[model samples]
Target: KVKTRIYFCGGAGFRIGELFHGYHEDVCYIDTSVQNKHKHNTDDNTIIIEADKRAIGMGKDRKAAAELISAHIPAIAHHFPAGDTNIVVYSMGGASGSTIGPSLVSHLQQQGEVVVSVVIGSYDSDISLRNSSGSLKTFEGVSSVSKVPMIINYHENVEGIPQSMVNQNILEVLNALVILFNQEHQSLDLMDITNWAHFHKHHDVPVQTVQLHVCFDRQEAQAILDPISIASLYTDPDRDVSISTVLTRTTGYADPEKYDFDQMHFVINGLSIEDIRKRLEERREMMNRAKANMRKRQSTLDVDDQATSSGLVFD
Candidate 1:
């Protein structure tokens, strides 16, 4: 009964779709690599957009990826019907996914489709960081952008935290929403999500997902009200923010006045464009310094090797 379509873009997007395919039937995967044909299980639903036959299979940067996929936007947007909800999933650090995902979302918006964007943050390589920062600047008029962090081994000190954790977390949240759509009570529908999206767009604010702990007790209510207590990926608790709550049915609450909702999900305010840009700048400087030091050490090693070679006369 729920009318929804999911579109995954790039390498990471394709992998995420593979995890999500178990829950939803309506899903599409997009990538520029010709080699993906052999790798993916959902060959029927996967779309391979060739950037150039002469060059390498994948895109090298965001700008090139956008230009390469520009011609295919209209056809891709047509996958979502007029009234159905569309979910765009992609990684913000990759050349193909970062560029193609936003471009497709913007195109779909013009055609009057309700869109939800799930952007996975990249911290893998230097170019990925640059790509992610570049892609963040172009988000305008997007309905909802859920920026999820990519938890790598380097980012966390704890053991057994693999990269698949990001995909698993995303899958859980999305599956919950999908199941909610089909519920008989149906307090939270597509329109409620759409309204929240419109509110953020009107106010020029970014939206990110956060877990809500619904409780009837005074202590629990106080904890829920505190923004710092809420678990979020990228949202800064200290900043000026807003929340849109989605309440679901539950039983056995003593007082109606004390706690209105039994269970809830929240979309909290995310970083502004300026805040993201500042962070990106700081990261760039740090990486640059590291690169410079590496180069200096390599040159010093080369000098030592040259001195040793010059000392061997008859060899």
Candidate 2:
């Protein structure tokens, strides 16, 4: 059974939901405020938990904020379905996300599931930094509750972009994950890689910073992943990894023999790179055509407006 689930919490979690929207049926959300509900366009599936009005803002009182949010978990407890893997996304800089996220994650862990918290860290503000620190410390306090917490820093990943663009980027990442996981190669499928992701999360060793990258060209793929020594990416002696290469027929084929895996990794699958490229090219072409049509439509509108001002009929 596919046991992967994504749970987004608080305001920052709303930002994530903007990207994910209807991509996954299992995607869950707990809208903490009206802003999160109306602004982010929370769907019918979203769990609406309107906490105390006074507890709404990102005030400095971490404990008070957590207590207020924690009080309502039991009300929405029915939504927490049984799953082997859960990816909890919470924005760490705000009181609601950081505080409530820690408590929620701990509670989920008590139910005996592997929880991986993806803490969205805000790099631009001091308050955000403080909130993130609070969340991290809370995770640390609980033994083996979380593993290799993936911190997607706003400044690092989406710095200097407008709010609109930031939303686009977050959504793109979610879509990419779905695409990556869905693609089937000769050796393995999405479930296999996800299982690998699970092993990386719950493995007995230590923290493994598993960075996911999709390379279009064979050379690009080699250049990106070939140079990294296991020491550079992981401190543990066992540096094994689960990898699947999706390449085009024209560019290259998956030849595990040509690649070196002394660092400890396996090619779980091999996919047709051409299939991916064709879809990408089709999207680009469609976008270009749409742009051209819009330009033509706008030019006609301008001509019509000028003619109307000069002599066109009007009541």
Candidate 3:
């Protein structure tokens, strides 16, 4: 599975719904903003309008806007699955991203899910004025004071320069983001990379950061993991890994008896990578005892089922 899923909760007016005719796949995008998008409501565009409420502080307009597609609760829940991870991305001043995004992270955390946020700095919807960098700092402060693992920062200084300019600005910033996420550990820090980008601005190409997942338990996985180790691996191609955890659980099966392992799906709201690992250890122990009795019970069922099926066959 691709480590990351691209999701949008009301972004910079990308009319995806009008572009893609009702045939959407893997990534999910929901426009929870109060902004009306009547202009792009076609099959080509899969962006859902009023999909969710803006973050609590975003005021009533954001909330009212989100309520429009609140019925997509199932889809919302599906995006966060157990043992999965996500990296949130949002355009600057979109009302929905900062407001709703943080709230969503809090809600998921309240339910013991792990989450991380990456806010990009860019121009506000109106004028060339850039959104307050304080917002980025505040978000980072919240993450750090809370000990949240990562808080990525990006800004658009080249606003109104032209499509080529906008694209160039995003590309340069996102390239750094992607580089940090791809390799496990790098020889540089954010400031170091930021400096490098500025220095390389002479190259004059746009950059994009693609989110990734590094599953440790999988076959190509490495065992020992820590924040420092993860950071170190960021530039290290051999060991770039994951930082996601399982959050809440949604029961899809009607029968509680079917609740063992498969009947339910995980609502992912990952915590600090280590926090998730600790919880994973706890869950494994819990399941270990249950499996002991389960194996004996399964053995008996296998023999019994074999006899029953033999008699049912007329041939």
Candidate 4:
């Protein structure tokens, strides 16, 4: 079975080609609208881009986009019954990711595999997605905001932290996710989504929104980027290692049995990505390894088929 699939649902500033353009060619990217420099592939016959003119003009959030794909992804993955995929969907902070990430968590959960989400917060005034009114928009990702079993998120426009620092925080999130997406790269303990905390619980009061900023295991990330001089220290905006803030408390308990409990982190650190690249890389690498392994199985099948045919023929 191929490892988890990393699918980017929607975003305003992301150029599919530019982000992944020259790097790993085998990696899969799901492009919804807009066009550019590279080729998008059909993974199990699923079209990466299914654009809605209306949706695009208004900007489709993660929730809306998930509703679009939920019907399709499951039927498609069945062909690769061996395809064990957990999708990590992201979008430009605000409506795009805010709406999309949650719906994706719902859709993918129905499809299978543990899904994790990272929300890039609002510290990113430079690249924030805006409303029709033309105001900077930054909303928390549903997964990370809610503490749903297979969800996680972070933010981009956090105050105080230098843009560079916030950016590094964002990059760590993506780095962890990319590696996590690549199921073959399972040895890294830092990629597991369970090691995080959401902050709303501390207030112990009802709220209406959630915003999170998590620090990825910089050490593991460095290890993936470069195997030497591992600095293993993931930072913390909160004392307990993670923080989750929602003017409204996040909904959904990761434990299906415990319907009322929620576990969002105001801030999470110690080797986690604030984005989704790590998981994709892991999956692609795993696929390569699987293909090599498949060759061995094919050879055995050919021998068996050939012997059966010979037995049927007159000797």
Candidate 1, superposed: residue stretches over 4 Å from native: 37-44, 54-56, 80-83, 140-161, 180-184, 200-262, 271-279, 292-315
When 3 and 4 are scored with lDDT, the better candidate is: 4
- Sort by TM-score, top down from the best: 1, 2, 4, 3
Q: Summarize candidate 4's per-residue lDDT along 202-224 as a digit string, tens digits.
A: 43522222223332433222223
Q: How many steric overlaps are in each model, in order?
A: 0, 4, 48, 74
lDDT of each: 0.53, 0.48, 0.35, 0.36
lDDT of each residue in 105-209, candidate 2, tens digit only:
666655545454555544344444445555545655543454432222121223465756655655555553443333322343444444444443333433422
Q: List runs of model 4 lying over 4 Å from the truth.
A: 12-17, 20-27, 36-57, 60-87, 92-100, 123-150, 158-169, 178-315
Highest lDDT against the true fold, candidate: 1
Off by over 4 Å in 3: 13-25, 33-75, 78-83, 108-118, 123-134, 137-150, 163-315
Name the candidate, 2 or 3, with the larger lDDT value: 2
lDDT of 3 at 161: 51
lDDT leaderboard ranking: 1, 2, 4, 3
Indicate whether candidate 2 or candidate 4 has the larger TM-score: 2
**Across residues 1-315, which tens digit of lDDT does each residue of candidate 1 receive?**
237677778877777777776687777777787554334455567777864553244544887887788788777666533236666777777888777777777776666555566666664568877776666655532333322211110111012467678677667656644443332232344555454444434343334332223222324333443222221111122321223232222211112243233343333233223445566677778888887888433332443343445564332
